């Protein structure tokens, strides 16, 4: 499994931004797939998680409601949509899956200017 | 029953029907309408100031109105001497039990920010000032002071209410002592069984009510907290896995101990019977030189010895089960959160709050079996009193 | 006493003298010499493997040798019938109580690395793997399994030992029942009082012993942990701040509870007296309308009502004190560590260990006060049995 | 008020000893528990030592217990940290801390312990 993050860039305070974490290797159809984020000057922080079927999604307190995580099991991709982006939501976003061993995505930088 | 309360079956049925009607009208429907009319925001504070917030105040007013209407109907329909203690006293006891459950819920909610602050302080030295800790402990002290006052007044009222029940039953029995004199053990009944029955029934009712409201209060809390626990240790992701694994653990702790301990009260009864027979043969030999002979007393002590050894050996299995469960439960709360601790989905405050909710749910499930154990002796004393009263009629 | 044990005063005095001699020879002197002879290192593992470590095995051998020498002296100086249950049965109970205290100490010691690892895992997501948590839980489960087995066997042996004591006393009483027949309520003495006096003495002895060893085990632990707590809140730096604060808190709690809980037994005895008088007047119900007249039962019930109300008020005071202390204790555990949490001198594991030590010390003081409470009823039953036996002489 | 100044500490080749002096200059600090903290490159500050207002009672962290000695020299307002048996991970910036109404950190000295 080789997680690849695509999307994310420069947006203003308040807006929308979609990220696609695509896997390429062993199927992740039966694994809970996580989205973490790391702000400059802090350790990594949990953002979201989606189960195997994609019906149940779990959110962090700071990103609940404003963030939506979905999973396209056919394409082995997980999509994270940010809406109403506060400037505090600037970070490198990572995608995580534990298929026997831990697999961390390359991470994509998301900037939310005021 | 007929002495303290009004017509018992009708009274209890009407109380249950009215409670169900009020719950249906409030928790689904008119409750939100009354909140909107009064203007309650719905933002319940975590401190001790929630107990006089608008939501709590309107609930208090609604409960007072419902209880007053029910009491007025029962006063006009069937007046009674002890109606003020039987009707209003029981309502007050139920309300105070609910208030104590709500205080426990408030403390559980306070447990999260306090330990989140503790974790933040332990992250880096001298990052969190001590005044923040003082403020948090002051909030907890306010909640605890409210709890202390309410619990003390509750115990006072409960004891006085129990004694009023005993007074009513004693008055009824003394009003008929001339006809109940000839019944064997009447003095023992009127002196001890009245108080024992009153205290036992009060305790069973309060324990069952508290067990019900503890679950009703801490199941939504656990459902809310389960959103931060996306994975269980070995099985993996199970929808609402935290709630399922807490209910299953509590059901194991209340339904495995009972299964391995169903023969315990059927053996304590045998041990009480053989000892009673031993004492009977001893007292028969007091004013008699021919009874309580060495062989007769030896063969009667051998029976109590052999029936005590059975209880001692059968309690071994229950001891193994209970002690093993109590030792495992210390860390089974954290076991279900290990994947969340590793993955960093919960903080220290949420983990502590979850482990507290687990303990309170287990306490409710323990209150249920305790209520059953109370009901055993309740049925015994009720059989005694019913036979004593029926021999009159 | 003379039926189960050998000469009671001499036996207990010799037991205490030999225990003091062995403690002096072991904890200061020959203990280290024997450890050096055996080549046992001072490293005590935190897992369940410490209980067969060389230090623990050496202590087991020393205790066995000392108890065997004491028993061999007492089996030949004054042979007895129940010497194998009173001399070698009390020593086993004492040893198992000490072993359970040591198991609690081992669990306390395990509490520090586990919560240190929890804090490390919560510092950053996916920094600590879950296998480390599984290993820690496995270590705790080994310790807990040892505790479960030992506790179950201890309860079995304690119950059988109590029944052997009751058997010895019952045999003695049946040996002289022909002379003890003409005594009021002798059947109650030989049946109820024997069992209750044996059980209460067993419980009081075990509770006192357990409290003493709990204090002895957990005071050095607190002294060692106090090196990470430079200063206490408000007062600042007190040389041994943690130990002094914990001891003072527990002592003031037990003193406050005992100051208001010494008046309660008198009121309880008064209530029992008026209830017994009410039953006695209800008895004589075979004496027609002459006895148990309405005025008499009215007066006796008024007396019992007044005494019950007095007990309710005094227990209201005691309840205020006890509930306030219990509510405060939960956060007074962490109040003394607030400056260390802020300054980052202790970790999560050390803080949890300190709170656990505080809880165990408070439990030891509670066991002491409950041992005194059991000694009260023990003195009552001993007075009853002593009068019953002296009436023969 | 109090202006903590750290002096001493430098480059050592392990096994050696280093003495750091935290000279205070301002309001008297002869009645406050005085702390020595440590920040390794890549981590956060760690507690190393604490000394009473009289120098009689000294408290050490587990990682630095025995190998480090903290002393007080009241009437000159100077606490002293003696580092013995300097292991290579005892390389860090060492800070001095005292709380007199408000917090006071010193400009910590960099200590390098080469292997
Ligand atoms: C015997 C005398 C009994 C008299 C009973 C008269 C009717 C009682 C009316 C109950 C109203 C319940 C109600 O309003 O609903 C609440 C649900 O119930 C409660 O919370 C109150 C508990 C009432 C329990 C009633 C039990 C009656 C049992 C009768 C049989 C007797 C059993 C043995 C005793 C909603 O509260 P909440 O916590 O969901 O939200 C409001 C709050 O401010 C937010 O926290
Ligand atoms: C009645 C029959 C009683 C028979 C008593 C005979 C003498 C018992 C010998 C006791 C030896 C004590 C000893 O060796 O010292 C230990 C101190 O005591 C103990 O720890 C054992 C408890 C002994 C308590 C003895 C109580 C005697 C009480 C007599 C009166 C009984 C009253 C009613 C009960 C040291 O252990 P430690 O934990 O400090 O270090 C060793 C260990 O491996 C490291 O953890």
């Amino acid at each position: 499994v080789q997680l690849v993050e695509s999307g994310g860039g420069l947006v203003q305070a308040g807006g929308s931004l979609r990220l696609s974490c695509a896997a390429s290797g062993f199927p992740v159809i039966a694994n809970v797939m996580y989205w973490y984020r790391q702000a400059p000057g802090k350790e990594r922080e949990w953002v979201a998680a989606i189960d195997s079927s994609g019906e149940y999604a779990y959110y962090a307190d700071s990103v609940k409601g404003r963030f939506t995580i979905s999973r396209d099991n056919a394409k082995n991709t997980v999509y994270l949509q940010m809406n109403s982006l506060k400037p505090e939501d600037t970070a490198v976003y990572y995608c995580y899956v534990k298929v026997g061993s831990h697999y961390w995505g390359q991470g994509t930088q998301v900037t939310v200017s005021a | 029953f007929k002495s303290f309360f009004p017509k018992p079956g009708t009274f209890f049925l009407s109380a249950f029907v009215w409670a169900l009607i009020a719950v249906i009208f409030w928790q689904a429907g008119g409750g939100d309408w009354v909140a909107r009319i009064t203007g309650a925001s719905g933002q319940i504070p975590i401190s001790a100031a929630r107990f006089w917030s608008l939501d709590f105040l309107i609930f208090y007013a609604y409960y007072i109105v419902c209880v007053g209407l029910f009491a007025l109907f029962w006063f006009i329909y069937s007046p009674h001497r002890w109606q003020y203690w039987s009707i209003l006293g029981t309502a007050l006891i139920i309300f105070v039990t609910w208030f104590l459950v709500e205080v426990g819920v408030a403390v559980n909610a306070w447990y999260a920010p306090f330990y989140d602050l503790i974790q933040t302080a332990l992250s880096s030295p001298h990052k969190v000032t001590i005044e923040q800790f003082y403020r948090e402990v002051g909030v907890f002290l306010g909640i605890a002071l409210i709890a202390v006052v309410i619990s003390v007044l509750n115990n006072f009222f409960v004891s006085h209410y129990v004694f009023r029940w005993r007074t009513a039953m004693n008055e009824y029995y003394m009003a008929n002592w001339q006809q109940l004199r000839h019944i064997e053990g009447a003095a023992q009944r009127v002196q001890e069984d009245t108080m024992r029955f009153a205290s036992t029934l009060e305790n069973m009712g309060v324990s069952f009510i508290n067990a019900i409201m503890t679950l009703i209060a801490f199941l939504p809390v656990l459902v809310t907290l389960s959103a931060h626990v996306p994975e269980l240790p070995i099985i993996g992701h199970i929808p609402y896995g935290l709630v399922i694994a807490a209910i299953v653990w509590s059901l194991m702790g209340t339904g495995l101990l009972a299964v391995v301990g169903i023969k315990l009260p059927g053996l304590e009864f045998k041990n009480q019977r053989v000892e009673a027979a031993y004492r009977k043969e001893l007292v028969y030999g007091e004013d008699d030189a021919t009874r309580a002979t060495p062989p007769t007393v030896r063969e009667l002590f051998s029976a109590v010895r052999k029936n005590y050894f059975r209880l001692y050996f059968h309690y071994m299995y229950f001891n193994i089960a209970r002690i093993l469960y109590l030792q495992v439960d210390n860390v089974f709360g954290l076991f279900l959160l290990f994947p969340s601790i590793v993955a960093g989905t919960i903080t220290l405050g949420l983990m502590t709050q979850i482990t507290n909710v687990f303990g309170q749910v287990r306490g409710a499930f323990q209150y249920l079996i305790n209520s059953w154990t109370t009901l055993v002796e309740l049925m015994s004393i009720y059989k005694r009193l019913r036979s004593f009263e029926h021999e009159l009629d």
Side-chain angles (χ1 to χ4, degrees), chain B residues 114-115 121-122 125-126 128 133-134 137 140 144 147-148 152 155 159-160 163-164 166-167 170 174 177 181 187-188 191 195 233 275 278-279 282-283 285-286 288 301 305 308-309 312 316 319-320 323 327 331 334-335 338 341-343 346 348:
Chain B
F114 183 56
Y115 276 93
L122 287 175
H126 285 300
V128 159
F133 285 108
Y134 286 164
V137 75
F140 174 77
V148 164
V152 160
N155 286 157
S159 291
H160 271 226
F163 200 89
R164 293 319 190 285
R166 143 149 196 180
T167 292
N170 215 96
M174 281 315 128
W177 184 249
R181 262 187 34 235
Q188 157 60 31
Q191 191 255 19
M195 191 64 167
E275 212 157 26
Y278 180 59
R279 193 162 146 197
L282 279 194
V283 62
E286 267 197 273
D288 208 336
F301 183 67
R305 174 165 56 217
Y308 256 99
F309 288 178
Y312 294 162
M316 202 146 48
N319 247 356
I320 302 163
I323 300 183
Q327 296 268 22
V331 198
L334 289 160
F335 175 65
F338 278 170
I341 291 170
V342 165
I346 64 181
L348 199 82

Coordinates of all heavy atoms in Angstrom, one line a residue, chain B residues 114-115 121-122 125-126 128 133-134 137 140 144 147-148 152 155 159-160 163-164 166-167 170 174 177 181 187-188 191 195 233 275 278-279 282-283 285-286 288 301 305 308-309 312 316 319-320 323 327 331 334-335 338 341-343 346 348:
Chain B
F114 N -10.8 19.1 33.2 CA -9.8 19.0 34.2 C -8.6 18.2 33.8 O -7.5 18.6 33.9 CB -10.4 18.5 35.5 CG -9.5 18.5 36.7 CD1 -8.9 19.6 37.1 CD2 -9.2 17.3 37.4 CE1 -8.0 19.6 38.1 CE2 -8.4 17.3 38.4 CZ -7.7 18.4 38.8
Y115 N -8.9 17.0 33.3 CA -7.8 16.1 32.9 C -7.2 16.6 31.6 O -6.0 16.3 31.3 CB -8.2 14.7 32.9 CG -8.2 14.0 34.2 CD1 -9.3 14.0 35.0 CD2 -7.0 13.4 34.7 CE1 -9.2 13.4 36.3 CE2 -6.9 12.8 35.9 CZ -8.1 12.8 36.7 OH -8.0 12.2 37.9
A121 N -0.8 20.7 31.1 CA 0.3 21.1 32.0 C 1.5 20.1 32.0 O 2.6 20.6 32.1 CB -0.3 21.2 33.4
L122 N 1.2 18.8 31.9 CA 2.3 17.9 31.9 C 3.0 17.8 30.6 O 4.1 17.2 30.5 CB 1.7 16.5 32.3 CG 1.4 16.2 33.7 CD1 0.7 14.9 33.9 CD2 2.6 16.4 34.6
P125 N 6.7 21.9 31.1 CA 6.7 22.5 32.5 C 6.4 24.0 32.4 O 6.9 24.7 31.6 CB 8.2 22.2 33.0 CG 9.0 22.0 31.7 CD 8.0 21.3 30.8
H126 N 5.6 24.4 33.4 CA 5.2 25.8 33.6 C 4.6 26.4 32.3 O 4.8 27.5 31.9 CB 6.4 26.6 34.0 CG 6.8 26.5 35.4 ND1 6.0 26.8 36.4 CD2 8.0 26.0 36.0 CE1 6.6 26.5 37.6 NE2 7.8 26.1 37.3
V128 N 1.0 25.7 32.1 CA -0.3 26.0 32.7 C -0.1 26.6 34.1 O 0.6 25.9 34.9 CB -1.2 24.8 32.7 CG1 -2.3 24.9 33.7 CG2 -1.8 24.5 31.3
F133 N -5.8 25.5 37.8 CA -6.1 24.3 38.6 C -7.0 24.7 39.8 O -7.9 24.0 40.1 CB -4.9 23.6 39.0 CG -4.2 22.8 38.0 CD1 -3.0 23.3 37.4 CD2 -4.7 21.6 37.5 CE1 -2.3 22.6 36.4 CE2 -4.0 20.9 36.5 CZ -2.9 21.4 36.0
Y134 N -6.7 25.8 40.4 CA -7.5 26.3 41.5 C -9.0 26.6 41.0 O -9.9 26.3 41.8 CB -6.9 27.5 42.1 CG -5.7 27.2 43.0 CD1 -4.8 28.3 43.3 CD2 -5.4 26.0 43.4 CE1 -3.7 28.0 44.1 CE2 -4.3 25.7 44.1 CZ -3.4 26.7 44.5 OH -2.3 26.4 45.2
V137 N -10.7 23.2 40.5 CA -11.1 22.5 41.8 C -12.2 23.3 42.5 O -13.0 22.7 43.2 CB -9.8 22.3 42.6 CG1 -9.4 23.6 43.3 CG2 -10.1 21.3 43.7
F140 N -15.4 22.2 40.9 CA -15.8 20.8 41.5 C -16.3 21.0 42.9 O -17.2 20.2 43.3 CB -14.6 19.9 41.4 CG -14.8 18.6 42.1 CD1 -15.6 17.6 41.4 CD2 -14.3 18.3 43.3 CE1 -15.9 16.4 42.1 CE2 -14.6 17.1 44.0 CZ -15.4 16.1 43.3
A144 N -19.7 19.6 44.4 CA -19.7 18.7 45.5 C -20.4 19.2 46.7 O -21.0 18.4 47.5 CB -18.2 18.3 45.9
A147 N -24.0 18.6 46.1 CA -24.3 17.1 46.3 C -24.4 16.8 47.8 O -25.2 16.0 48.2 CB -23.2 16.3 45.6
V148 N -23.4 17.3 48.6 CA -23.4 17.0 50.0 C -24.7 17.4 50.7 O -25.3 16.7 51.4 CB -22.2 17.6 50.7 CG1 -22.3 17.6 52.2 CG2 -20.9 16.9 50.3
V152 N -27.5 14.8 52.2 CA -27.8 14.8 53.7 C -29.3 15.0 53.9 O -29.9 14.2 54.7 CB -26.9 15.8 54.4 CG1 -27.5 16.2 55.7 CG2 -25.5 15.3 54.5
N155 N -31.2 11.8 53.0 CA -31.1 10.7 54.0 C -32.0 11.1 55.2 O -32.7 10.2 55.7 CB -29.7 10.6 54.5 CG -28.8 9.9 53.5 OD1 -27.6 10.0 53.5 ND2 -29.4 9.1 52.6
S159 N -35.2 8.6 56.1 CA -35.4 8.0 57.4 C -36.8 8.4 58.1 O -37.5 7.5 58.6 CB -34.3 8.4 58.3 OG -33.1 7.8 57.9
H160 N -37.1 9.7 58.0 CA -38.4 10.1 58.6 C -39.6 9.5 57.9 O -40.6 9.1 58.5 CB -38.5 11.6 58.6 CG -37.9 12.2 59.8 ND1 -38.5 13.2 60.5 CD2 -36.7 12.0 60.5 CE1 -37.8 13.6 61.6 NE2 -36.7 12.8 61.6
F163 N -39.9 5.9 58.9 CA -40.6 5.8 60.3 C -42.0 6.2 60.2 O -42.8 5.6 61.0 CB -39.8 6.7 61.3 CG -40.1 6.3 62.7 CD1 -39.3 5.3 63.3 CD2 -41.2 6.8 63.4 CE1 -39.6 4.9 64.6 CE2 -41.4 6.4 64.7 CZ -40.6 5.5 65.3
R164 N -42.5 7.1 59.3 CA -43.9 7.3 59.2 C -44.6 6.1 58.7 O -45.8 5.8 59.1 CB -44.1 8.5 58.3 CG -43.6 9.8 58.8 CD -43.9 10.0 60.3 NE -43.6 11.3 60.8 CZ -42.4 11.8 61.0 NH1 -41.3 11.1 60.8 NH2 -42.3 13.1 61.4
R166 N -43.7 3.0 59.2 CA -43.8 2.1 60.4 C -44.9 2.5 61.3 O -45.6 1.7 61.9 CB -42.4 2.0 61.0 CG -42.5 1.9 62.6 CD -41.4 1.1 63.2 NE -41.7 0.7 64.5 CZ -40.8 0.0 65.3 NH1 -39.7 -0.4 64.9 NH2 -41.2 -0.3 66.5
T167 N -45.0 3.9 61.6 CA -46.0 4.4 62.5 C -47.4 4.0 62.0 O -48.3 3.6 62.8 CB -45.8 5.9 62.6 OG1 -44.6 6.2 63.3 CG2 -47.0 6.5 63.4
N170 N -48.0 0.3 62.5 CA -48.1 0.0 63.9 C -49.5 0.5 64.4 O -50.1 -0.2 65.2 CB -47.0 0.7 64.7 CG -46.6 -0.1 65.9 OD1 -45.6 -0.9 65.8 ND2 -47.3 0.0 67.0
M174 N -52.2 -2.0 66.1 CA -52.7 -1.8 67.5 C -54.2 -1.5 67.5 O -54.8 -1.9 68.5 CB -51.9 -0.6 68.1 CG -50.5 -1.0 68.6 SD -50.6 -2.5 69.6 CE -49.3 -3.4 68.8
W177 N -55.3 -5.1 67.8 CA -54.5 -6.0 68.7 C -55.3 -6.9 69.4 O -54.9 -8.1 69.7 CB -53.6 -5.2 69.6 CG -52.7 -6.0 70.5 CD1 -52.8 -6.2 71.8 CD2 -51.5 -6.7 70.0 NE1 -51.7 -7.0 72.2 CE2 -51.0 -7.4 71.1 CE3 -50.9 -6.9 68.8 CZ2 -49.8 -8.2 71.0 CZ3 -49.8 -7.7 68.7 CH2 -49.3 -8.3 69.8
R181 N -54.1 -10.8 69.0 CA -53.3 -11.3 70.2 C -53.0 -12.8 70.1 O -51.9 -13.2 70.4 CB -54.1 -11.0 71.5 CG -53.6 -9.7 72.2 CD -54.3 -9.6 73.5 NE -54.5 -10.9 74.2 CZ -55.7 -11.3 74.6 NH1 -56.8 -10.6 74.4 NH2 -55.7 -12.5 75.1
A187 N -46.3 -10.2 68.6 CA -45.4 -9.2 69.1 C -44.2 -9.0 68.3 O -43.8 -7.9 68.0 CB -45.0 -9.5 70.6
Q188 N -43.6 -10.1 67.9 CA -42.4 -10.1 67.0 C -42.7 -9.4 65.7 O -42.0 -8.5 65.3 CB -41.8 -11.5 66.8 CG -41.0 -11.6 65.5 CD -39.8 -10.8 65.5 OE1 -39.2 -10.5 66.5 NE2 -39.4 -10.3 64.3
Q191 N -43.4 -5.6 66.3 CA -42.2 -4.8 66.7 C -41.1 -4.7 65.7 O -40.7 -3.6 65.4 CB -41.7 -5.4 68.0 CG -40.6 -4.6 68.7 CD -39.2 -5.1 68.5 OE1 -38.9 -5.9 67.6 NE2 -38.3 -4.7 69.3
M195 N -40.9 -2.5 60.9 CA -39.7 -1.6 60.5 C -38.8 -2.3 59.5 O -38.4 -1.6 58.6 CB -38.9 -1.3 61.8 CG -37.8 -0.3 61.6 SD -38.5 1.4 61.2 CE -37.1 2.4 61.4
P233 N -10.1 -3.1 20.4 CA -8.8 -3.6 20.3 C -8.6 -4.8 19.3 O -7.7 -4.7 18.4 CB -8.6 -4.2 21.7 CG -9.4 -3.3 22.6 CD -10.6 -3.0 21.7
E275 N -29.2 -24.7 61.8 CA -28.9 -24.0 63.0 C -30.1 -23.8 63.9 O -30.0 -23.8 65.1 CB -28.1 -22.7 62.7 CG -27.1 -22.4 63.7 CD -26.0 -21.4 63.2 OE1 -26.3 -20.7 62.2 OE2 -24.9 -21.4 63.7
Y278 N -30.9 -26.9 65.6 CA -30.0 -27.1 66.7 C -30.4 -26.3 67.9 O -30.4 -26.8 69.0 CB -28.6 -26.8 66.2 CG -27.5 -26.9 67.2 CD1 -27.2 -28.1 67.8 CD2 -26.7 -25.8 67.6 CE1 -26.2 -28.3 68.7 CE2 -25.7 -26.0 68.5 CZ -25.5 -27.2 69.1 OH -24.5 -27.3 70.0
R279 N -30.7 -25.0 67.7 CA -31.1 -24.2 68.8 C -32.4 -24.7 69.4 O -32.6 -24.6 70.6 CB -31.2 -22.8 68.4 CG -31.4 -21.8 69.6 CD -31.1 -20.4 69.2 NE -31.9 -19.4 69.9 CZ -32.1 -18.1 69.5 NH1 -31.5 -17.6 68.4 NH2 -32.9 -17.4 70.3
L282 N -31.6 -27.5 71.6 CA -30.9 -27.0 72.8 C -31.9 -26.4 73.8 O -31.9 -26.7 75.0 CB -29.9 -26.0 72.4 CG -28.6 -26.5 71.9 CD1 -27.5 -25.5 71.9 CD2 -28.1 -27.7 72.8
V283 N -32.8 -25.6 73.3 CA -33.8 -24.9 74.2 C -34.8 -25.9 74.8 O -35.2 -25.8 75.9 CB -34.5 -23.7 73.5 CG1 -35.3 -24.2 72.3 CG2 -35.4 -23.0 74.5
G285 N -34.0 -28.8 75.7 CA -33.2 -29.4 76.7 C -32.9 -28.6 77.9 O -32.2 -29.0 78.8
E286 N -33.3 -27.3 77.9 CA -33.0 -26.4 79.0 C -33.8 -26.8 80.3 O -33.3 -27.2 81.3 CB -33.3 -25.0 78.6 CG -32.2 -24.2 78.1 CD -32.4 -22.7 78.1 OE1 -32.9 -22.2 77.1 OE2 -32.0 -22.1 79.1
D288 N -35.4 -29.6 80.7 CA -35.6 -31.0 80.5 C -34.3 -31.7 80.6 O -33.4 -31.5 79.8 CB -36.3 -31.3 79.2 CG -37.1 -32.5 79.2 OD1 -36.8 -33.4 80.0 OD2 -38.1 -32.6 78.3
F301 N -25.4 -31.3 65.6 CA -24.3 -30.4 65.2 C -23.5 -30.9 64.0 O -23.0 -30.1 63.2 CB -23.3 -30.3 66.4 CG -22.2 -29.3 66.1 CD1 -22.4 -28.0 66.0 CD2 -20.9 -29.8 66.0 CE1 -21.4 -27.1 65.7 CE2 -19.8 -28.9 65.8 CZ -20.1 -27.6 65.6
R305 N -22.6 -28.6 60.7 CA -21.2 -28.6 60.2 C -21.2 -29.0 58.7 O -20.5 -28.3 57.9 CB -20.4 -29.6 61.0 CG -19.0 -29.7 60.5 CD -18.1 -30.4 61.6 NE -18.6 -31.7 62.0 CZ -18.6 -32.1 63.3 NH1 -18.0 -31.4 64.2 NH2 -19.1 -33.3 63.6
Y308 N -22.7 -26.3 56.6 CA -21.8 -25.1 56.5 C -20.6 -25.3 55.6 O -20.2 -24.4 54.9 CB -21.3 -24.8 57.9 CG -22.0 -23.6 58.5 CD1 -23.0 -23.7 59.4 CD2 -21.6 -22.3 58.2 CE1 -23.6 -22.6 60.0 CE2 -22.2 -21.2 58.8 CZ -23.2 -21.4 59.7 OH -23.8 -20.3 60.2
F309 N -20.1 -26.6 55.6 CA -19.0 -26.9 54.7 C -19.4 -26.8 53.2 O -18.6 -26.4 52.3 CB -18.4 -28.2 55.0 CG -17.6 -28.3 56.2 CD1 -17.0 -29.5 56.7 CD2 -17.4 -27.1 57.0 CE1 -16.3 -29.5 57.8 CE2 -16.6 -27.2 58.1 CZ -16.1 -28.4 58.6
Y312 N -19.3 -23.1 52.4 CA -18.0 -22.7 52.3 C -17.3 -23.1 51.0 O -16.5 -22.4 50.4 CB -17.1 -23.2 53.5 CG -17.5 -22.7 54.8 CD1 -17.2 -23.3 56.0 CD2 -18.2 -21.5 54.9 CE1 -17.5 -22.8 57.2 CE2 -18.6 -21.0 56.1 CZ -18.2 -21.6 57.3 OH -18.6 -21.1 58.5
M316 N -16.7 -20.7 47.0 CA -15.4 -20.6 46.4 C -15.5 -20.2 44.9 O -14.8 -19.4 44.4 CB -14.6 -21.9 46.5 CG -13.1 -21.8 46.3 SD -12.2 -23.0 47.4 CE -13.1 -24.5 47.0
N319 N -16.5 -16.6 44.7 CA -15.4 -15.8 45.0 C -14.4 -15.7 43.8 O -14.0 -14.6 43.5 CB -14.7 -16.4 46.2 CG -14.8 -15.5 47.4 OD1 -15.3 -14.4 47.3 ND2 -14.3 -15.9 48.6
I320 N -14.1 -16.8 43.2 CA -13.2 -16.8 42.0 C -13.8 -15.9 41.0 O -13.2 -15.0 40.4 CB -13.0 -18.2 41.5 CG1 -12.4 -19.1 42.5 CG2 -12.1 -18.1 40.2 CD1 -12.5 -20.6 42.2
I323 N -14.0 -12.0 42.2 CA -12.6 -11.4 42.4 C -12.0 -11.2 41.0 O -11.3 -10.2 40.7 CB -11.8 -12.2 43.4 CG1 -12.5 -12.2 44.8 CG2 -10.4 -11.5 43.5 CD1 -11.6 -12.8 45.8
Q327 N -10.9 -7.7 39.4 CA -9.5 -7.4 39.0 C -9.4 -7.0 37.5 O -8.6 -6.1 37.2 CB -8.6 -8.5 39.4 CG -8.5 -8.8 40.9 CD -7.4 -8.1 41.5 OE1 -6.9 -7.1 41.0 NE2 -6.9 -8.6 42.7
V331 N -8.7 -2.6 34.5 CA -8.0 -2.2 33.3 C -8.8 -2.5 32.0 O -8.4 -2.1 30.9 CB -6.6 -2.9 33.2 CG1 -5.7 -2.2 32.2 CG2 -6.0 -2.9 34.6
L334 N -9.7 0.8 30.2 CA -8.6 1.3 29.4 C -8.3 0.3 28.2 O -7.7 0.8 27.2 CB -7.3 1.5 30.2 CG -7.4 2.6 31.2 CD1 -6.3 2.4 32.3 CD2 -7.1 3.9 30.5
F335 N -8.6 -1.0 28.3 CA -8.3 -1.9 27.2 C -9.1 -1.5 26.0 O -8.5 -1.5 24.9 CB -8.6 -3.3 27.7 CG -8.5 -4.3 26.6 CD1 -7.3 -4.6 26.1 CD2 -9.6 -5.0 26.2 CE1 -7.1 -5.6 25.1 CE2 -9.5 -6.0 25.2 CZ -8.2 -6.3 24.6
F338 N -7.3 1.5 24.3 CA -5.9 1.3 23.9 C -5.7 1.8 22.4 O -4.8 2.5 22.1 CB -5.4 -0.1 24.1 CG -5.0 -0.3 25.5 CD1 -4.7 -1.6 25.9 CD2 -4.8 0.7 26.4 CE1 -4.2 -1.9 27.2 CE2 -4.4 0.5 27.7 CZ -4.1 -0.8 28.1
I341 N -6.0 5.5 22.3 CA -4.8 6.1 23.0 C -3.6 6.1 22.0 O -2.9 7.1 21.8 CB -4.5 5.4 24.3 CG1 -5.5 5.7 25.3 CG2 -3.1 5.9 24.8 CD1 -5.4 4.9 26.6
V342 N -3.4 4.9 21.3 CA -2.3 4.8 20.4 C -2.5 5.8 19.2 O -1.6 6.5 18.8 CB -2.2 3.3 19.9 CG1 -1.3 3.3 18.7 CG2 -1.6 2.5 21.0
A343 N -3.7 5.8 18.6 CA -4.0 6.6 17.5 C -4.2 8.1 17.8 O -4.3 8.9 16.8 CB -5.2 6.0 16.7
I346 N -8.6 10.2 21.3 CA -9.1 10.7 22.6 C -7.9 11.3 23.3 O -6.8 11.0 23.1 CB -9.8 9.6 23.4 CG1 -8.8 8.6 23.9 CG2 -10.9 9.0 22.7 CD1 -9.4 7.5 24.7
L348 N -6.7 12.9 27.4 CA -6.7 12.3 28.8 C -8.0 12.6 29.4 O -8.5 11.7 30.1 CB -5.6 13.0 29.6 CG -5.1 12.3 30.9 CD1 -4.2 11.2 30.6 CD2 -4.5 13.3 31.9

